[PDB]
Amino acid sequence: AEAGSRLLAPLKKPLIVSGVLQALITLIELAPFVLLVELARLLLGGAEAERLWTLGLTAVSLIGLGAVLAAAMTLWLHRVDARFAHELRGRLLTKLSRLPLGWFTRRGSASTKQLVQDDTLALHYLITHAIPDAVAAVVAPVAVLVYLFVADWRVALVLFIPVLVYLVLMSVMTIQSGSKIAQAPRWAERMGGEAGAFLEGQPVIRIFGGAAASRFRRRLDDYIDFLVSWQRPFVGKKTLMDLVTRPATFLWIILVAGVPLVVTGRMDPVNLLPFLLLGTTFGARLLGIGYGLSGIQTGMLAARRIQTVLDEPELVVRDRTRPGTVELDRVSFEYRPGVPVIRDVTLTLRPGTVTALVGPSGSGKSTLAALVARFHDVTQGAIRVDGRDIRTLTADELYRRVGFVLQDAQLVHGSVAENIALAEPDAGLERIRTAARDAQIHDRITRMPDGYDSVLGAGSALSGGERQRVTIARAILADTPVLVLDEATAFADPESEYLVQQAINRLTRDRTVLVIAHRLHTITHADQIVVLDDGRIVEVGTHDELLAAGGRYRGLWDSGRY
Amino acid sequence: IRTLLRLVPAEKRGAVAGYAVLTLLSVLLRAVGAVLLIPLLAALFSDTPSDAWLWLGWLTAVTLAGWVTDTNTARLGFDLGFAVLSRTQHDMADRLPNVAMSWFTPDNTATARQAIAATGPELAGLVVNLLTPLIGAALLPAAIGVALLFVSVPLGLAALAGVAVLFGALALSGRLSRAADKVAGETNSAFTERIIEFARTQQALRAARRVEPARSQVGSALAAQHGAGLRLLTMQIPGQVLFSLAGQVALIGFAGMAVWLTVRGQLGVPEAIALIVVLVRYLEPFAAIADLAPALETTRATLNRIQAVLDAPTLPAGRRRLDRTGAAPSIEFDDVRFSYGDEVVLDGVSFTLRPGNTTAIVGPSGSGKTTILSLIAGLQQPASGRVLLDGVDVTTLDPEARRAAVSVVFQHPYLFDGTLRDNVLVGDPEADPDDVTAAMRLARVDELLDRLPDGDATVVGEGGTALSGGERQRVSIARALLKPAPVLLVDEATSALDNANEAAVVDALTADPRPRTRVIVAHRLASIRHADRVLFVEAGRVVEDGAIDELLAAGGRFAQFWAQ
């Protein structure tokens, strides 16, 4: 695979060394049985006691040496793989920090987890075990079979029958399960999302349809049906391989071929000792890679998926290369190709001026804030903060220059001080407390049992208006040259809404503001009102100017009173 | 195996008994076939090798019975493993909607997610992958040791002594690696939660510059998960050394007793040579136990998580059902009290709703308005005090009857990942298209179909991510109206809609032809238009109620709430 060998290039030298070491280790693991064959042969021949002791003790010691070496080899190799996964998962978390934000919306959180965690974990057999098991399953069977072919071809060729049956079973098992392996990660992705939606949308499930009619239960039944069809013939072939390759099976076939040869005069019983001792040890080697091809097939697919995300476009900080002045210029944007959400928006925002963006729902007034944040790149036009393009600014400079509130109070699992101080984790408690006091949430925090240390994960959430005010406190603590507010204080009651707006205006008196609100009565103070309808600027002016103009703004204002 | 036997269905315990008998027969046949080499080779090495035929026939029968028994053991292990998979996964799916909402702490939600995430082939192949070879490896050298007693008594006890150190090694190796394996699971589960939060909260993290791995929380969880996985690899070194020593200790004891007997003439040289092969068969389970011992620790954690979900405390219920279907019922609270943990939300609510009328709940943010709707809908339940639908206790009502009684519009509209119509149809999947269009039209979703390119087939994202805030609010409102339940609770249907969409939706909450007892929640005076009675709630109790103009004239907290 081009996408696999490119991802596993850093582990080149460890992988070839592992194949070389395992070739020597497995040879060392077959040495004792060569010495025990000599010990048995000397016992029948009546050699002296001291000669027997040297052979017997050497074989027993070599068993300990082989076991220590194999344990040490896998220990080093399992530490190499653990380090590569940590580096690879770090690489992925760096890439996802830079991908356009439309990557996440089309994909969901379940697919991201299956990428960062489960796909990297799916490589474990491919790195840590594939090359040792492959080399072990080539060296030991070839070494044993050639050695036994020298000892006696009649009983040696009979050992090929369980070998060929194992070779046929593994190929049939591999071909049959190949399609199912490809479908497995997508099924896991779907069930990860459905399970996450089942757990996240519990209030909807409990009222609308219950457990029986839930989409999760239908998928859960379908996934288990897929697993049964995948795992029934797979495990059936898997156990046939074990039965074929068992040492008991090998010993039985050797004796079936050997006993009629020994009872007849065709061969002496002394020549059974290589077969009875060495002929029954390479079965486990074959089974190691037989059970491993599914691990290689999943690993190669996961390597392809991981490298594909690492090859994704990146919102590259271009090298082309008045404070707080955001200037949109002939901007157009499309979430999906052929679906315009913004159509030639020209708008300039100056320091100390509050620009209000209003319009019908679905008119694209949140895409403008997203493009100003550079969650997505503008399809046309440009957005310049202090002249410099956002595409030329780095992420740190951009998000130091402009801060955002995003209409969806996304909190992170942790203390509420850590949620308020998301921008500056090094920020002190006094800075956090002052930010919350301005956002009118500090009073709510004091009533919690843990205070500001109260963990804020799922289940321990807050009311809708309370979690919104937390994200306002987050933007207050950032203190950026530009502020943007996407439906801030939407869930707030009138008193708290007035207090929050007063605090916001007091803080950003001389700072650029872009406020989005559906309640136009809160927008009467705006220096300029921007009306967005179907992604195009239909009118710009003050509140009284738009009321006199009698357009979309006047229609919305009239329909507000009901 | 004790934990795994809890999850077995009671209807399938005949298969378990059949499985356990066949597994023992697998071990007994394997040991007998191994020990059958001692008299077979002794006869073969003698001056009359024809005596080997009898022992070869006994070996063939013992092996052929082994293949049949091992194939059946596989079939029963597959069936038992997938039987436990389907029944446990389905029982979690049935139980979880009835599990208390207090159960879903962020740690339990992780456990429930990991428990559901175990649906893959790993858990389904548990009996075949782990349990069958573990029982086989555990009892194979014990069975060979017992079978050796028939040849030589002390030789058998030497083999049994080797089994004693193996089980001692198995017990000790598990103990040594236990603490590190537990920590590895905790950091690997925490890292899972942070990736899901990392992808689900990208916009906020990116704006805060908390998205790089050197500065993110997912990066810290990755760093913790790396160290927890490294120390586990170090702490399994004692376990691997201990199994190696156990294999060598048993090898020395077995070989030491064979030579000790052979020197005395109590054991023939062919029998001694045959015992080298049986000794190889003896030592193979010692290595297999070492390979499977770490897997036993992880599987114990997996089943413990599944049992944790199945142990979750379910909501109280009963068997009562209302007298007639789709009759507008009365709703009343009787000293209802409720608290999230220790935080008290509602502290003595008592009111009554007329059947068929529409009353509007109002109050400040965080007052507990959505909690009131939760108790009416039955998502929550009071600590003390009771809620009655039509003079019938909800807590003693049937799960289906209580479910059919209420359809709600939630404060934060959550849409499942799917088409727009799929989310609307969740209100009533068996509803004809004529009522579907009526519910869509009243919610002003028909103004989204023309605007959006794909109409009602538009693929919503996770939650309502691929739709705007107002768009998902209207789709949620269509879902509530479509359901034919005679109670309609409305929670912040205005919060994301413009003035034109607000007015039509608010008026459409009455244009609904069906008779219902409606409950409206809002912080906006225009949205509570048409309300027959207003319920003002503050500090966890109804402080004031009446008519809109009555209270405004009275100049109460209702008036002050609009006067700011």
Ligand SMILES: Nc1ncnc2c1ncn2[C@@H]1O[C@H](COP(=O)(O)OP(=O)(O)OP(=O)(O)O)[C@@H](O)[C@H]1O
């Ligand atoms: N994440 C997204 N992926 C794809 N399309 C989207 C996404 N978010 C919004 N849209 C589409 O963009 C248009 C509305 O965009 P946007 O979210 O900016 O609306 P809005 O005017 O801010 O909404 P509202 O006032 O209801 O909050 C609709 O076509 C919606 O389908």
Ligand SMILES: Nc1ncnc2c1ncn2[C@@H]1O[C@H](COP(=O)(O)OP(=O)(O)OP(=O)(O)O)[C@@H](O)[C@H]1O
């Ligand atoms: N999961 C939770 N865990 C703990 N406290 C909670 C939880 N959900 C809500 N609360 C608290 O319960 C009280 C009432 O919450 P609720 O969501 O019912 O309020 P509300 O009236 O709907 O508010 P809003 O108008 O802000 O949406 C508030 O103190 C809120 O912080």
Ligand SMILES: [Mg+2]
């Ligand atoms: Mg919006």
Ligand SMILES: [Mg+2]
């Ligand atoms: Mg609420």
Ligand SMILES: [Zn+2]
């Ligand atoms: Zn491994």
